Amino acid sequence: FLEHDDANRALMGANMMRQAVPLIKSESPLVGTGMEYRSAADAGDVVKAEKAGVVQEVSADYITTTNDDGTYITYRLAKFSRSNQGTSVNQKVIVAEGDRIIEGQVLADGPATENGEMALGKNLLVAFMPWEGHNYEDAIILSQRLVQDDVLSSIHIEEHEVDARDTKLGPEEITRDIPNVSEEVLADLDERGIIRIGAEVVAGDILVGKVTPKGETELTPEERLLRAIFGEKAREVRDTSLKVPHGEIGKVIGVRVFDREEGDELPPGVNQLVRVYVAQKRKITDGDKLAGRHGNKGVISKINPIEDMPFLEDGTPVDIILNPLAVPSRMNPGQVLEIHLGWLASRGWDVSGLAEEWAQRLQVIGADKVEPGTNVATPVFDGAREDELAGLLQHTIPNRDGERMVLPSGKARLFDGRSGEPFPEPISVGYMYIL
Amino acid sequence: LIAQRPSLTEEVVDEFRSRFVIEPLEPGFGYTLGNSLRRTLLSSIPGAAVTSIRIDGVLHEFTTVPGVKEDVTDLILNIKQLVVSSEHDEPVVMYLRKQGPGLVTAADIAPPAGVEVHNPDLVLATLNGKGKLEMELTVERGRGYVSAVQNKQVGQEIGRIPVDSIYSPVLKVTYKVEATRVEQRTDFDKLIVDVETKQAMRPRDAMASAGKTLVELFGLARELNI
Amino acid sequence: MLIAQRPSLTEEVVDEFRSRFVIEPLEPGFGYTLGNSLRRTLLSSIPGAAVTSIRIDGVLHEFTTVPGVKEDVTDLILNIKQLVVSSEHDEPVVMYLRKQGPGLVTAADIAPPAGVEVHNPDLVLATLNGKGKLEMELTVERGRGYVSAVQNKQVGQEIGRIPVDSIYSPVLKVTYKVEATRVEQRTDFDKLIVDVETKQAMRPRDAMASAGKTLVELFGLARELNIDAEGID
Amino acid sequence: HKRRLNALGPGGLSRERAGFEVRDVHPSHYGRMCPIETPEGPNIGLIGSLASYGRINPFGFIETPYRKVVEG
Amino acid sequence: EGIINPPIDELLEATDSKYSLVIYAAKRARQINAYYSQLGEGLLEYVGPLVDTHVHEKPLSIALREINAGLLTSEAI
Amino acid sequence: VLEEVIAEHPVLLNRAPTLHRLGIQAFEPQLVEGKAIQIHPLVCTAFN
Amino acid sequence: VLGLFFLTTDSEGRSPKGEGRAFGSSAEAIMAFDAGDLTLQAKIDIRFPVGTIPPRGFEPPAREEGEPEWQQGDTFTLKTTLGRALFNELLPEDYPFVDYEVGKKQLSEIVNDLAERYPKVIVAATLDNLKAAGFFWATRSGVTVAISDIVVPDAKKEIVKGYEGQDEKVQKQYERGLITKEERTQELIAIWTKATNEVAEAMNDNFPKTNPVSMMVNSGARGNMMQMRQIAGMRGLVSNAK
RNA sequence: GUAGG
Ligand SMILES: [Mg+2]
Pairing type for strands C18-26 and A427-434 reads unpaired
Query: What is the number of other CB atoms lying within 10 angstroms of the CB of residue A5?
Result: 23
Q: How far is the C-alpha of B175 from the C-alpha of B192, rounded, in Å?
A: 6
C and F interact (at least 3 Cβ pairs within 8 A): yes
The three-point CA angle G163-G164-G169 to 5° equals 100
Element (H, E) at G125: helix G120-141
Nearest to C15 by CA among C200, C217, C188: C200
Taking the C-alpha atoms of residue C205 and residue C211, their distance in angstroms, rounded to an integer, is 10
| Alpha-helix runs per DSSP H in chain B | 30-43, 72-80, 203-223
Q: Is C49 exposed, middle or buried (0-12, 13-18, 19+ CB in 10 A)?
A: buried
Residue A187, amino acid: A
Longest dimension (CA), chain B: 78
Measured in residues, chain G has a length of 242
Q: Name, in order, each residue with C-beta under 8 angstroms of B185's C-beta and a sequence gap of 6 or more.
A: C147, C148, C150
Residue type, A92: K
Of E3, E56, E57, the CB nearest to F10: E3
DSSP string, chain C: ---SS----EEEESSSSEEEEEEEEE-TT-HHHHHHHHHHIIIIISEEEEEEEEEETT--SS----TTBSS-HHHHHHHHHHS-EEE--SS-EEEEEE--SSEEEESTT-B--TTEEES----EEEEE-SS---EEEEEEEEEESEE-----SHHHH-TTEEE--EE--SEEEEEEEEEEEEETTEEEEEEEEEEEEE-SSS-HHHHHHHHHHHHHHHHHGGGGG--------
Cβ separation C182–F3 shorter than 8 A: yes
Please give, rounded to a whole number of angstroms, the shortest distance from the CA of C169 to a CA of chain G.
10
Q: Look at residues C192, C23, C30 and name the one whose alpha carbon lies nearest to residue B225.
A: C23
CA–CA dist B215, C232 (Å, integer): 12
**Facing residues of B52 across strands?**
B138, B162
> Is there a contact between G34 and B28 if contact means CB atoms under 8 Å apart?
yes
Residue range C48-168 forms a domain whose CATH class is mainly beta
CA of A86 to C1' of H1 (A): 19
* E-state strands within F8-48: 11-14, 24-27
Q: What secondary structure letter does DSSP report for E74?
A: -
Cβ C146 vs Cβ C170: under 8 Å: no
Residue of G nearest to C76 (CA): G24
Under 8 Å between Cβ of G47 and G27: no
Chains F and D touch (3+ CB pairs under 8 A): no
Q: How was this structure determined?
A: cryo-EM
CB contact at 8 A, C16 and C102:
no
Task: Give the CA-to-C1' distance from A87 to H2 in angstroms.
Answer: 18
Q: Name the CATH topology of B47-167.
A: RNA Polymerase Alpha Subunit; Chain A, domain 2 (2.170.120)
Q: Please report, to the nearest 10 degrees, the dihedral formed by the alpha carbons of residues A294, A297, A300, A302 taken in order.
A: -70
The tally of CA atoms less than 13 A away on the side-chain side of residue A81 is 9
Distance (Å, whole) CA A330 – CA G231? 10
Q: What angle do CA C40, C45, C49 make, to 5 degrees?
A: 125
Could you say which of B8, B43, B209 has the minimum Cβ distance to residue C228?
Answer: B209
Residue type at G241 in one-letter notation: A
How many other C-beta atoms are found inside a 10 Å radius of the C-beta of residue D50? 17
Those nucleotides of strand H lying less than 7 Å from any protein Cβ are 1-5
* Residue C5: HSE in the Cβ half-sphere, 13 Å Cα cutoff: 19
Contacts (Cβ under 8 Å, ≥6 apart) of E4: G121, G124
Q: How far apart are CA G220 and CA A325, in angstroms?
A: 11
Q: Are A130 and A322 in contact (CB under 8 A)?
A: no
Q: SS3 of G101, please?
A: coil
Distance from C-alpha of B114 to C-alpha of G198, rounded to nearest angstrom: 78
CA B56/CA A252 separation, integer angstroms: 17
Q: How many CB atoms lie within 10 A of CB G168?
A: 9
Residues after which a C–N gap over 2.5 Å breaks chain A: none
How far apart, in whole angstroms, are the C-alpha atoms of residue A281 and residue A250? 8
| Closest approach of G227 to chain D, Cα-based (Å) | 20
Measured distance CA(B94)–CA(B48) in Å, rounded? 13
Q: Which residue does chain A place closest to G219, by CA atoms?
A: A325
Q: Quick one: which of A241, A157, A179, A256 has its CA closest to A205?
A: A241
Residue numbers 270-329 of A with CB closer than 7 A to any atom of strand H: 297
Closest CA to C126 of C165, C78, C76: C76
How does G37-64 read in b/e, with b if 16+ C-beta sit within 10 Å?
bbbbbbebebbbeeebbbbeebeeeeee
Q: Identity (one letter) of the amino acid at G93?
A: E
- Which contiguous run of DSSP H or E holds residue A394? helix A386-394
In angstroms, the CA of F36 and the C1' of H4 are apart by 16
Residue F27 φ then ψ, to 5°: -145, 155
C-alpha distance from D64 to closest chain A C-alpha (Å): 18
Picking from C199, C178, C228, the residue whose alpha carbon sits closest to that of residue C48 is C199
The HSE-up count of residue C27 (CA atoms within 13 Å, CB side) is 22
Task: Tell me the backbone φ, ψ of residue A360, rounded to 5 degrees.
Answer: -60, -40
Helix axes B30-43, C31-40, angle to 10 degrees: 160
User: Hey, what domains does chain G have and what are their CATH numbers?
Assistant: 1-141 (1.10.274.100), 154-242 (1.10.132.30)
Query: Which whole-number Å values give the CA distances from G183 to G124, G160, G162, G190, G240, in the listed order?
Result: 62, 22, 21, 11, 19
The pair phi, psi for residue C100, each rounded to 5°, is: -135, 180
What is the spatial distance between Cα B210 and Cα B217, in angstroms, rounded to a whole number?
A: 11
N- to C-terminal Cα separation, chain D: 41
The helix/strand/coil state of B84 is: strand
**CB neighbours (10 Å) of residue A378?**
19
Q: CA–CA separation, B185 vs B175, rounded Å? A: 23
Q: Which has the closest alpha carbon to C206: C22, C7, C32, C21?
A: C21
Strand H-contacting residues in D 5-64, CB cut-off 7 angstroms: 6, 8, 15, 39-43, 47
Q: Which nucleotide shows the minimum CA-to-C1' distance to residue D4?
A: H2
Q: Cβ A421–B32 below 8 Å, yes or no?
A: yes
Beta strands in G105-211 (DSSP E): none
Dist CA B114 CA A221 (whole Å): 69
β-strand partners of A53: A67
**Does residue G138 contact residue A130 with C-beta atoms inside 8 Å?**
yes
CA G87, CA G107: separation in Å to the nearest integer?
11
**How close is the Cα of A278 to the center of ligand 1, in Å?**
32
Amino acid at A309: M
Distance A329 CA to H2 C1' (A): 30
Residue-wise DSSP of A197-232 = SS-EEETT-BSB-EE-S-------HHHHHHHHHHT-
Residue B222 gets which letter from DSSP? H
Whether the CB-CB separation of A66 and A75 falls below 8 Å is answered with no
Distance from CA of C222 to the nearest CA of B (A): 5
Please answer whether residues B84 and B117 qualify as being in contact, where contact means their C-beta atoms are separated by less than 8 angstroms. Answer: yes
State the Cα angle at G108 between G106 and G114, rounded to 5°.
Answer: 105
Question: C-alpha angle with apex F7: C181 to F33, nearest 5 degrees?
Answer: 45
| C-alpha to C-alpha distance for G59 and G40, rounded to whole angstroms | 26
Q: Which of C45, C142, C14, C42 is nearest to C84 (CA)?
A: C142
* Min Cα–Cα distance to chain D from G200, Å: 27
Residues in Cβ contact with G197 at an 8 Å cutoff, skipping those fewer than 6 apart = none
DSSP one-letter code for B121: T
Strands of B8-14's sheet in order across:
B8-14, B17-22, B191-197, B170-176
Residues G47/G23, Cβ–Cβ less than 8 Å: yes
> Number of residue pairs across A and B with CB atoms under 8 Å?
101
Residue E13, classed as helix, strand or coil, is helix
| CA-based nearest residue to C201, from C174, C172, C177, C228 | C172
Q: How far is the CA of A88 from the centre of ligand 1 (A)?
A: 29
Q: What is the distance between the alpha carbons of residues G242 and G229, in angstroms, rounded to a whole number?
A: 25
Task: Report the alpha-carbon distance of residue E38 to residue B106 in Å, rounded.
Answer: 71
Of G223, G191, G218, whose CA–CA distance to G207 is shortest?
A: G218
Let me know: does G2 contact G107? Beta carbons within 8 Å: no
Burial B180-214 (b: 16+ CB within 10 A, else e): beeeeebebbbbbbbbbbbebbbbbbbbbbbbbbb
Contact, F2 vs F31, CB < 8 A?
A: yes
Measured CA to CA, the distance from residue G144 to residue A127 in angstroms comes to: 9
> What are residue G161's phi and psi, to 5 degrees?
-65, -40
Give the chains touching C; criterion: ≥3 Cβ pairs < 8 Å. Answer: A, B, F, G
Residues of the domain holding E32: 1-77
Pairing, β A53-58 against β A62-67 = antiparallel
Which residue lies nearest H4, CA-to-C1' measured? D41
CA A203 → C1' H5, Å? 29
Instruction: Identify the helix (H) or strand (E) that includes residue D39.
Output: none
- Name the C residues in 48-87 with CB < 8 Å from any B CB: none
If you ran DSSP here, which 8-state letter would residue A397 be given? Answer: P
* First CA to last CA distance, chain C: 9
Residue A10 φ/ψ region, left for φ over 0, alpha for ψ in the -120 to 50 degree band, beta for the rest: alpha
Cβ burial C196-209 (10 Å sphere, 16+ → b, else e)? bebbebbebbebbb
Gap between the Cα atoms of B139 and B88, Å rounded: 9
CATH number at residue A220: 2.40.50.150
Q: What phi and psi, each to the nearest 5 degrees, are found at residue B221?
A: -60, -45
Tally of domains within chain E:
1
Q: E59-69 and E8-15 are packed helices; what angle lies between their axes, rounded to 10 degrees?
A: 70
> Cα–Cα distance between B121 and E39 in angstroms, integer?
74
Residues in chain C within 8 Å Cβ distance of B36: 33-34, 36-37
DSSP state of B185: S
Helix axes G225-232, G181-206, angle to 10 degrees: 100
CB-based contact C42:C208 (threshold 8 Å) = yes
| Residues contacting A116, CB < 8 A, separation 6+ | A37, A40, A41, A46, A48, A94, A106, A109
